[PDB]
Amino acid sequence: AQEQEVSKVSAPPNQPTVQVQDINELQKFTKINTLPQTEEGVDLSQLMQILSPVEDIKEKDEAWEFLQLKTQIYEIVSNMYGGNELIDDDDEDDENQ
């Protein structure tokens, strides 16, 4: 009873819900300010190819921890290099265990 309450009080989002706020913004923002672009004879859609969807970019005041930050983007770099899972696959853990 106290365990659940304390965990909910702190609840450090480790991996699973770091920034999970994914909602279609290619259509949400295009309704916000694109109207006078379509109204006039202006084609700036090529320039907008730079802009990243904003819902993924989270905007809240949180606390950043050096150790935590280290762990997070170490996991990100290991993922983006894609080397752990390959050697895990050629490790054949399931065949042995």
Partner: protein, 712 residues
């Protein structure tokens, strides 16, 4: 932990355009477990539990419809077959008699029969179908039939033999007595399928009813009908509920085609099998324990029946996890338990947990328990001889690791091909990534926050890890995979075993395969002499010293630990201590004139006779310090006086060893050996004079007849 299929029998005789099908509904199990039952459309099947083969041919034509339920009588002597022919048959059963099974008493309701149950004590039968429920007593042979308002689906008699519980698909749960009166009624909104009564237990001694409703819940009900408030939720709709003997486990099946195991509290442990179809009935093998019987009883047996028509048997074996650091041995008992045993007084201390323990690691006066999504640490009051355990800290963080270790102010977890360093608070601190799976890890002592460790990989390369370095140090390379590693007392050598049960000894200063051995199960190093190595094969344990022939014992067991004049041998899950005589290595060291190492070996607790022998040998070979130590460790007065005389006369006089050898022999009762040794070189007259003081002038005269007096 490991679940293995045993034998599968399939029934493919599907009959289209006929109400008889190939499905199997129930599977009754005998109390002894030597026979097994199953029911199929228009037939019954008798099986042997250990090996899958029909002891008796399938019986057909007895019931013109399907068979809904088959049950035993808790004594292995009766059969009860309920059929959609609106009839229940009761058969007599006996293995030795020429008719193994034969009908005894048959009765019929007004409508179809759906469920049946037996009385553990009085062996009364309660059969409930649509519109009716009936009670049968063997003595009177007069059935009592009563009407109801809806069809009962499930029944179960309490283990006390007093209460009865039935459920209806209309949501009504009824609890009655042996007189069939409305003791308690509970109304729900979902159908009732599976019900059971918790087994009687000396720790609990109270019976409650566990019922699985179809709204994804399992509920506990008291005798009066008041719910206990558990109302545990489930992802899937349950179908069958079975309680193991002594009320320790709970086998749950239903939707998702999986057979899972739970504790009586509700903690998930494992799943048994996924049959790709609904499992109508799963049963557990009863066990019988003798008066004071000793056995781990890790083995478990389950029987499953699927909707396709497969009656399968599965065997579950629990692996052993234990830890041994010093003066303590903490091993996992029957699941959700930790027992700490002391090797001296054989006393035990029990710690009970509710969730499954995955790893046990004990540091200096610190015990670490790795519960599912929980970490516990307990300390010890060192001043008191008996250990008192108190919980300083608890870790709520969920961590997955096949190997867990605890060091001073830190924790180490091995998962896949990665090593994670955890602070006691819970936050991750440091990461290590290796090429292959980390198989074995060994922790060596050191400063807090600076404890080193050894790591073995599936490739075989042996690495060293420091807490703060964050850079692995390659120790050596091995071609074959590593199963277990050990380090010497002075960190001079290292013994490593491969997957082929091959033992290899590597020198750290010079990486060279000095020693190789075949067919080795376990090995250990001494903690005091640094040189002795004790390795145990499947049947024989060998101890080996430096450049010495091996010594055999024919000791049954595996070597776990080696201490000063002590060897720990672990059989099954209990371990004992065996003392080893150090006289052989003593003699071998005396052969090569290595008195320092011989004295070091003798210091390991050898008998005083060997101490006296070593003192004599050292005194003869002009080593006075070791001689004094040996003659002092055992309280002796004449020998130390003779040693003082020898050390005083060594500098000045000749110090002929013959005289002192004769005096050593004459200090015992062996006078003739001393006389022979004294006559050997040339000391006749002094032998004469030493024999005279014993007042045996006659034998001294016989001696002085031969000896001369070269003076003047």
């Amino acid at each position: 932990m490991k679940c293995s299929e045993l034998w599968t029998e399939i029934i493919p005789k599907n009959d289209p355009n006929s109400n008889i099908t190939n499905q199997v509904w129930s599977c009754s199990f005998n109390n002894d477990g030597s026979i097994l039952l199953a029911c199929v459309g228009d037939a019954i099947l008798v099986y042997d539990s250990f090996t899958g083969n029909l002891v008796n041919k399938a019986i057909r034509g007895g019931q013109k419809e399907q068979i809904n339920c088959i049950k035993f009588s808790k004594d292995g002597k009766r059969f009860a077959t309920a059929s959609n022919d609106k009839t229940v048959w009761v058969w007599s059963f006996d293995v030795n008699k020429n008719p193994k099974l034969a009908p005894e008493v048959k009765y019929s309701h007004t409508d179809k029969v759906l469920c049946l149950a037996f009385n553990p004590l009085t062996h009364q039968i309660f059969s409930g179908g649509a519109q009716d429920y009936a009670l049968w007593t063997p003595d009177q042979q007069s059935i009592e039939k009563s009407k109801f308002k809806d069809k009962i689906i499930t029944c179960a008699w309490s283990w006390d033999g007093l209460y009865l519980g039935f459920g209806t698909m209309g949501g009504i749960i009824g609890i009655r007595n042996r007189a069939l009166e409305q003791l308690a009624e509970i109304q729900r909104s979902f159908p009732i399928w599976c019900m059971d009564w918790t087994p009687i237990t000396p720790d609990y001694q109270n019976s409650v009813l566990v019922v699985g409703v179809w709204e994804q819940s399992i509920a506990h009900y008291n005798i009066q009908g008041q719910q206990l408030g558990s109302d545990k939720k489930l992802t899937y709709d349950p179908i069958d509920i079975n309680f193991s003997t002594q009320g320790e486990f709970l086998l749950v099946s239903g939707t998702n085609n999986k057979c899972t195991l739970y504790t009586r509290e509700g903690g998930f442990l494992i799943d048994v099998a996924t049959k790709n179809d609904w499992v109508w009935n799963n049963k557990l093998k009863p066990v019988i324990k003798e008066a004071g019987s000793v056995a781990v009883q890790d083995q478990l047996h389950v029987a499953l029946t699927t909707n396709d028509g497969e009656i399968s048997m599965f065997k579950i074996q629990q692996l052993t996890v234990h830890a041994l650091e010093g003066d303590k041995y903490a091993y996992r008992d029957n699941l959700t338990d930790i027992v700490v045993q002391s090797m001296s007084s054989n006393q035990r201390i029990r710690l009970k947990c509710k969730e499954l323990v995955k790893n046990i690691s004990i540091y200096k006066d610190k015990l670490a328990a790795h519960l599912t999504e929980r970490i516990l640490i307990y300390g010890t009051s060192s001043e008191d001889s008996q250990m008192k355990y108190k919980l300083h800290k608890r870790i709520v963080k969920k961590v997955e690791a096949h190997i867990l270790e605890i060091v001073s102010n830190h924790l180490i977890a091995c998962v896949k091909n990665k090593v994670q360093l955890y602070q006691l608070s819970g936050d991750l601190e440091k990461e290590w990534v290796f090429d292959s799976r980390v198989n074995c890890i060994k922790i060596i002592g050191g400063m807090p926050n600076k404890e080193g460790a050894y790591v073995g990989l599936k490739n075989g390369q042996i690495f060293k890890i420091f807490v703060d370095n964050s850079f692995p140090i390659p120790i050596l390379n091995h071609n074959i995979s590593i199963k277990n590693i050990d380090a010497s007392q002075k960190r001079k050598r290292l013994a490593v075993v491969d997957k082929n049960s091959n033992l290899t000894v590597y020198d750290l200063s010079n990486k060279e395969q000095v020693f190789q051995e075949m067919n080795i199960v376990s090995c250990a190093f001494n903690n005091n002499f640094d040189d002795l190595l004790a390795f145990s094969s499947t049947d024989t344990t060998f101890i080996r010293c430096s450049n010495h022939p091996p010594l055999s014992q024919k000791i049954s067991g595996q070597v776990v630990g080696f201490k000063a004049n002590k060897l720990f041998v672990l059989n099954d899950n209990v371990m004992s201590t065996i003392d080893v005589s150090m006289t052989q290595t003593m003699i071998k060291y005396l052969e090569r004139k290595e008195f320092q190492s011989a004295y070091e070996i003798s210091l390991l607790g050898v008998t005083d006779q060997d101490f006296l022998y070593l003192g004599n040998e050292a005194l003869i070979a002009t080593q006075f310090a070791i001689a004094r130590k040996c003659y002092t460790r055992i309280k002796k007065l004449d020998f130390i006086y003779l040693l003082e005389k020898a050390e005083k006369d060594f500098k000045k006089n000749t110090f002929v060893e013959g005289f002192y050898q004769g005096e050593i022999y004459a200090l015992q009762t062996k006078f003739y050996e001393a006389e022979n040794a004294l006559t050997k070189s040339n000391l006749a007259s002094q032998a004469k004079e030493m024999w005279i003081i014993l007042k045996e002038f006659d034998k001294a005269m016989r001696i002085t007849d031969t000896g001369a007096s070269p003076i003047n």
